[PDB]
Design a protein around this nucleic acid. Structure first.
Ligand code: MG
Ligand code: MG
Ligand code: MG
Ligand code: MG
Ligand code: MG
Ligand code: ZN
Ligand code: ZN
Lengths: 42, 118, 205, 80, 146, 157, 37, 140, 148
RNA sequence: CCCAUAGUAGGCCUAAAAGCAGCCACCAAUUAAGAAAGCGUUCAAGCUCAACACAAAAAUCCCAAACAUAUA
RNA sequence: ACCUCGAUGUUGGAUCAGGACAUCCCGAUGGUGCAGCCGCUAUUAAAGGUUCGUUUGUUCAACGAUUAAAGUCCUACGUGAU
């Protein structure tokens, strides 16, 4: 089970999957920035 | 009692142990059930071997592992024993093992219609 | 004329000047022929794609064979193949200019109706062969009535209004929240994350 | 099968099991091939009798039984 | 419960039948599970609960008779299959590898000779997805595939 | 690769994470709601009229008969003024309470074939039934007076 | 048997059964209808 | 078993439409046609007549007959030998309501045909529908 | 005692149009193999076969494979033999092809098309890089009237 | 799940094509039923709609070991 | 046109073969427009096997004679420090 060519660049790449940890990290950043929006609105 | 281990799910039929004798055509793939029937210690031994760190100490460690298929243990090993570790999984009870008091304590959930063969 | 009209392979007068492969004509929601017109059933395009003359013949033959001429009538909601796909020779090294016209084809965008049926007949009577034709089509397609089309649309607004996710693709893309516009296309601001290439994700709010 | 007799008392509390039984199996749709049988319906807790001239008498008290149960019992007895 | 007795003459007699325990915690519910507040709080090993919907020979009882919701009937059926395969109902039988949480019948699964690459691994199912909504007492979700 | 591709192109991992984070989340509709708490009128009027038109009524289970046998039975009944009827229990059970027939509830279940008449040829009808040893007579109620099978036999004799 | 990705009953006696892990269309009257998923 | 035939009384031995179709069960064609001709003499001659023959398992004949057919009867009453082609717009003969009633008077009497409806409407409407399906206009 | 069947002789394979190249001779020349002739179809008599009840549907003679590279020719289609009872008259639409009486009497009912020529077939001192790729000629196809 | 009376094989042309090769009307009785929606008949005959009624496969050898529920 | 142009021609053949199964034969099954024999089709099966000659450098191909069969492929179109 090999991915043709070089991984992560070609037309056919290794399937990458989003972990719950990654989702939580992104959501944390989004919350910080929503607060930034609020504090920049005044 | 490594002969009496229990696999969750259908691992007894799906888990496959792969080995190669080195010779061409020497690839052998044996389900967990077949491996267990052949050697009643192999499954636990392989699990521990895979969990141990992959260095030169691993086989020295495996020399300290003593696997016995059944309740019998050699006398010297028994005399060496110091502590017994709690079993990681608590064995669920069967109805045959439940006491009538416990059955009574558990409520009846529904009224079966009287006119039913059952 | 309660029958589906025959579609020519290529326009009678061709385009002397070769034109570029503007894939934008397949990318994104369809803005034309998105609504029913003198009909009750149709084939909805749930994705973008190019309809070759072979697809046109498949549709025409299947529908004409499997509809009642006197009651059921059909109408094309898509122009005839008009975009030349200048497929080059059957082997040659790259270069030498642009290729020559070999096939003609009509672009289709998601949300576009391809064929529209009508007449005295209910939806289930037609679902069978319309669904077969939809599967035959080169893009995702669906046999849709007027009622089902409006139902799925209203469901889409219901989703957009009731989702409990505080984070929507629209909010994040428009606000450039995580600098994600460094990863998104400018078209994503208007596709709202529901379109990726020529594929349309209906399940996604 | 040689003879069958169905009795029930709808004047008293009804028993739909035997009613459905006689509606289903005691029909010429079946007797056309089961011509050897003689059906009688003597109506007045219920009682379904089946007489086999060989060695068997079958008595069904289809009060608490149901149509499916009694039909299966009849079929099993016919198979013998 | 009616039982048929033979002697040939055969007759059906209604015998003693249990009744729902007094004082349901949540009276006026759709299903017994909802009435007793057990929507997401029973597992394959809860034989005391499971056997109440089980024929004497091990089969499940019909949903019309039990009164269970459709989803709860499916959950109970799957939990009963798992309990039987785990050997927790030794007496509810028609007439040696220890298992538990077995989704499939042992004789219908093929060995995984070629587990795929890391991104397409063929995983061994454990438990049932029907119980995915059970009460979560663990920090990490319980895995349905091993 | 072009922006539009025949295959589904691989997304930048950041875009994939964005999609996952912005996936639709359906609302939870509180406690599980499931677990939470003119032929019809033609028949109505026809049966209303019939209940007064008929003076004597009876019912049988003429479902065990063939098409030809049923036709012959209908012919023998039409020889007299009696008329054979059938109507759903689904609509007849309301009819019993509508016409104030409490004793008639446990008489009509399954296939029921009414025998509405005003002149009793029940003697000859029973004679015809005799040569066909099945299709037993069922209880009825003449002019609001419930009659069992023994009552019908006595009335016939 | 005939291998089909989608199983369709052909006559009235064609019945679907999931056996040994996969679906089958069995038929007593017309064994020609035997299908395997 | 019942055998249904629409033979014409004029010709008692047409051939294929009786011989092979009746010979499968086992029949005496001579007796069958003799009885059919007896009925033909009993009734007017030269008119299609449905039959209700029932071939008993004992190999015996019980022929039952009634009124003649209805399509040919209506065509004759309208003075038509062959019906209209379209039968939705084409018409060749017109039959008045009084004539329809007069013919219906002697129509609701057969036993096998089951035309035993007490009301006159049941029969008049049925024959009117038959005529409408045929190429005959119902006057007034 | 009477039967109509459809035969279909094999279609010749199509030639190849390749060109050879190797480490010290980049332009190795035409390299397309010829296609294989289609398979003939033949009716043969058998004393064992009683009648035309065991007949079948379009008897399709096998088609020769296409030419390959390296001048590899294509295998000619295999000969398909049909069998019939002794004393069978074989006709086309009126024309009588053969009265097959003897045990094993055999007649060619549909020839197979000649295989196509690859581009190397057209190689010559004059034509040094042909590209022509003749397709396989089709095989005779016809309906047969069989009567005993 | 049931079972399917009858005007009549509705006529037309069609050897007859009756529901089925095809047009045109598509009424009708009992309480209740489309002069044809699918098999099968040269044509008939025999069966079902209903309504009565109640996904995957490639070539050296699979590829961490494992684990469903101890508190976020 | 991404590795190799600071001694690796290439094709066939010989020798020895490792492997895949998308099975040519041998094995076990379902269906059949399979009465039997026979075929046709599909599922499963890779343990084993899978010929010798004429022309041609040939791989192929044709032809001759066989065979249970003379399978489709990959292996730097396996294998020239053999
Ligand atoms: Mg790589
Ligand atoms: Mg470059
Ligand atoms: Mg060097
Ligand atoms: Mg295989
Ligand atoms: Mg290569
Ligand atoms: Zn509930
Ligand atoms: Zn079948």
């Amino acid at each position: 089970g090999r991915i043709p060519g070089r991984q992560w660049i070609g037309k056919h790449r290794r399937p990458r999957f989003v972990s719950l940890r990654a989702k939580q990290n992104m959501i944390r950043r989004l919350e910080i920035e929503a607060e930034n929006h609020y504090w920049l609105s005044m | 009692n490594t002969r009496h281990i229990a696999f969750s799910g259908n691992k007894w039929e799906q888990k496959v142990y792969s080995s190669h004798t080195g010779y061409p055509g020497g690839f052998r793939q044996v389900t967990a059930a077949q491996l267990h029937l052949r050697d009643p210690v192999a499954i636990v031994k392989l699990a521990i071997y895979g969990m141990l760190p992959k260095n030169l100490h691993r086989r020295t460690m495996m020399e300290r592992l003593h696997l016995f298929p059944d309740e019998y243990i050699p006398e010297d090993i028994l005399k060496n024993l110091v502590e017994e570790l709690p079993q990681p999984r608590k064995i669920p009870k069967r109805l045959d093992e439940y006491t009538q008091e416990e059955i009574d304590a558990f409520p009846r959930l529904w009224t079966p219609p009287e006119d039913y063969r059952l | 004329k309660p029958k589906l009209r025959f579609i020519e392979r290529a326009p009678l007068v061709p385009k002397v000047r070769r034109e570029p492969k503007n894939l934008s004509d397949i990318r994104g929601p369809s803005t034309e022929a998105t609504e029913f017109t003198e009909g009750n059933f149709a084939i909805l395009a749930l994705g973008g794609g190019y309809l070759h003359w072979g697809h046109f013949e498949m549709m025409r033959l299947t529908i004409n064979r499997s509809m009642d001429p006197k009651n059921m009538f059909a109408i094309w909601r898509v122009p005839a193949p008009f975009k030349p796909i200048t497929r080059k020779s059957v082997g040659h090294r790259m270069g030498g200019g642009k290729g020559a016209i070999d096939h003609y084809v009509t672009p289709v965008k998601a949300g576009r109706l391809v064929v529209e049926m009508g007449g005295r007949c209910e939806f289930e009577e037609v679902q069978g062969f319309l669904d077969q034709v939809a599967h035959k089509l080169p893009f995702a397609a669906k046999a849709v009535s007027r009622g089902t089309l409006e139902k799925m649309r209203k469901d889409q607004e219901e989703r957009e209004r009731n989702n409990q996710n505080p984070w929507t693709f629209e909010r994040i893309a428009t606000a450039n929240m995580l600098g994600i516009r460094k990863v998104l296309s400018p078209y994503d601001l208007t596709h709202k994350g529901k379109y990726w290439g020529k594929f349309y994700m209906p399940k996604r709010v | 099968v040689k003879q069958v007799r169905v009795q029930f008392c709808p004047f008293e509390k009804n028993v739909e099991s035997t009613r459905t039984f006689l509606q289903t199996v005691s029909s010429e749709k079946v007797r056309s091939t089961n011509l050897n049988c003689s059906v009688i319906a003597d109506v007045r807790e219920p009682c379904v009798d089946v007489l086999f001239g060989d060695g068997h008498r079958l008595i069904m008290r289809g009060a608490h039984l149901t149509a499916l149960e009694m039909l299966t019992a009849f079929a099993s007895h016919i198979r013998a | 419960f009616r039982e048929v007795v033979e002697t040939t003459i055969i007759e059906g007699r209604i015998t003693a039948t249990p009744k729902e325990s007094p004082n349901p915690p949540n009276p006026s519910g759709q299903c017994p599970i909802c009435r007793w507040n057990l929507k997401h709080k029973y597992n394959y090993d809860d034989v005391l609960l499971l056997s109440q919907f089980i024929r004497p020979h091990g089969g499940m009882l019909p949903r019309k008779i039990t009164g269970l919701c459709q989803e709860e009937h499916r959950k109970i059926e799957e939990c009963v299959k798992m309990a039987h395969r785990a050997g927790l109902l030794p007496n509810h039988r028609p007439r040696q590898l220890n298992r538990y949480l077995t989704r499939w019948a042992p004789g219908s699964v093929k060995p995984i000779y070629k587990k795929g690459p890391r991104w397409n691994r063929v995983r061994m199912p454990v438990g049932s997805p029907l119980l995915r909504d059970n009460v979560c007492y663990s920090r990490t979700p319980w895995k349905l595939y091993h | 690769s072009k922006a539009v591709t025949r295959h589904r192109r691989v997304m930048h991992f950041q875009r994939q994470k964005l999609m996952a984070v912005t996936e639709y989340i359906p609302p939870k509709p509180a406690i599980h709601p499931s677990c939470l708490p003119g032929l019809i009128r033609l028949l109505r009027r026809e049966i209303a009229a019939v209940f007064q038109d008929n003076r004597m009524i009876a019912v049988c289970q003429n479902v065990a008969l063939s098409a030809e046998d049923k036709l012959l039975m209908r012919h023998q009944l039409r020889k007299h003024k009696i008329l054979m009827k059938v109507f759903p229990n689904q609509v007849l059970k309301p009819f019993l309470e509508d016409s104030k027939y409490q004793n008639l509830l446990p008489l009509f279940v399954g296939h029921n074939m009414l025998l509405v008449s005003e002149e009793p040829k029940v003697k000859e009808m029973v004679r015809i039934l005799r040569t066909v040893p099945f299709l037993p007579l069922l209880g009825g109620c003449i002019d609001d007076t419930i009659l069992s099978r023994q009552g019908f036999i006595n009335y016939s004799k | 048997f005939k291998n089909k990705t989608v199983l369709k009953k052909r006559c009235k006696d064609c019945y679907l059964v999931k056996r040994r892990g996969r679906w089958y269309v069995y038929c007593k009257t017309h064994p020609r209808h035997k299908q395997r998923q | 078993g019942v055998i249904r035939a629409i033979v014409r009384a004029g010709l008692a031995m047409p051939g294929p439409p009786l011989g092979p179709v009746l010979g499968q069960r086992g029949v005496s064609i001579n007796q069958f046609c003799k009885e059919f001709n007896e009925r033909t003499k009993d009734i007017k001659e030269g008119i299609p007549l449905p039959t209700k023959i029932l071939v008993k398992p004992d190999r015996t004949f019980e022929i039952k007959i009634g009124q003649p057919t209805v399509s040919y009867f209506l065509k004759a009453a309208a003075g038509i030998e062959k019906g209209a082609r379209q039968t939705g717009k084409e018409v060749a003969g017109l039959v008045t309501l009084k004539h329809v009633y007069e013919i219906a008077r002697i129509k609701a009497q057969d036993e096998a045909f089951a035309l035993q409806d007490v009301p006159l409407s049941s029969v008049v409407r049925s024959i009117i529908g038959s005529a409408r399906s045929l190429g005959i206009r119902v006057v007034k | 005692d009477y039967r109509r069947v459809l035969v279909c002789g094999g279609n010749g394979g199509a030639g190849a149009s390749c060109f050879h190249s190797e480490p010290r001779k980049e332009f190795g020349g035409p390299d397309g193999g010829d296609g294989g002739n289609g398979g003939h179809v033949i009716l043969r008599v058998d004393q064992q076969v009683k009648s035309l009840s065991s007949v079948l549907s379009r008897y399709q003679g096998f088609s020769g494979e296409d030419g390959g590279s390296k001048n590899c020719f294509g295998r000619s289609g295999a000969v398909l033999y049909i069998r019939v009872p002794v004393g069978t008259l074989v006709k086309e639409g009126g024309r009588v092809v053969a009265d097959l009486s003897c045990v094993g009497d055999e007649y060619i009912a549909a020839l197979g098309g000649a295989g196509g020529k690859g581009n190397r077939f057209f190689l010559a001192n004059n034509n040094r890089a042909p590209v022509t790729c003749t397709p396989g000629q089709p095989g005779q196809q016809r309906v047969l009237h069989l009567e005993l």
